[PDB]
Amino acid sequence: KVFGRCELAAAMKRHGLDNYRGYSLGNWVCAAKFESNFNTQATNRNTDGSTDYGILQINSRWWCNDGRTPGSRNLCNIPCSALLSSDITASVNCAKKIVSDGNGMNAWVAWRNRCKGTDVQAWIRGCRL
């Protein structure tokens, strides 16, 4: 599923990401924009042999199991394919663990390079939330 911007904002808010670990909703929407282009089916292989999955590009080395990643830990206890669903529940629950792991949203490299420090409020402009 390719989410609309306000569609994704409303779902992320419903699942408790707005101000989660102190990160405003616009931070999460901006992260998803630049990690996945709002596409739940996005996958991208990393050089270490892991892969990132889903709307928030969650990695198969620490967080989900994809069966082909050396040193896999599966800390979210979920198959990586569950993170590709049109229902973002599993991605949000895993994202909550990731953003709590010590480095905050810097775990998302596109957030750090493209969203951090910017006017992230713009990502929820116009939305009825």
Q: What is the CATH number of the domain that holds 52?
A: 1.10.530.10
Pair 89, 11: CB distance under 8 Å: no
Instruction: Tokens for 115, please give them.
Output: 């969203």
Going by C-alpha positions, the residue among 127, 124, 126 that lies closest to residue 33 is 124
Side chain identity at residue 16, one-letter code? G
d(CA 114, CA 94): 22
- Catalytic residue flag (residue 119): no
CA 96 vs. chain centroid, Å, equals 9
Annotated binding site for substrate: 101
CB-based contacts of 114, cutoff 8 Å, min separation 6: 30, 34
Pair 34, 115: CB distance under 8 Å: yes
Deposited resolution, Å: 1.4
Query: Which experimental method was this entry solved with?
Result: X-ray
Pair 13, 20: CB distance under 8 Å: no
Tell whether the torsion through CA atoms of 104, 97, 82 and 7 is positive or negative: negative
Pair 46, 52: CB distance under 8 Å: yes
d(CA 38, CA 24): 17
Enclosing domain of residue 114 = 1-129
Starting at the earlier edge strand, list the strands of the sheet with 58-59. Answer: 43-45, 51-53, 58-59
Choosing from 7, 18, 35, 87, the catalytic residue is 35
Annotated binding site: 101
Q: CA 70, 46, 56 angle in degrees (round to 5)? A: 105
Pair 37, 28: CB distance under 8 Å: no
Choosing from 18, 48, 52, 66, the catalytic residue is 52
User: Domains in the chain: how many in total?
Assistant: 1
**Residue in the structure block whose two tokens are 């992230």:** 120
Side chain identity at residue 45, one-letter code? R
The continuous run of DSSP H or E covering 52 comes out as: strand 51-53
The Cα-based distances of 11 to 4, 7, 8, 75, 102 in angstroms read: 11, 6, 5, 23, 25
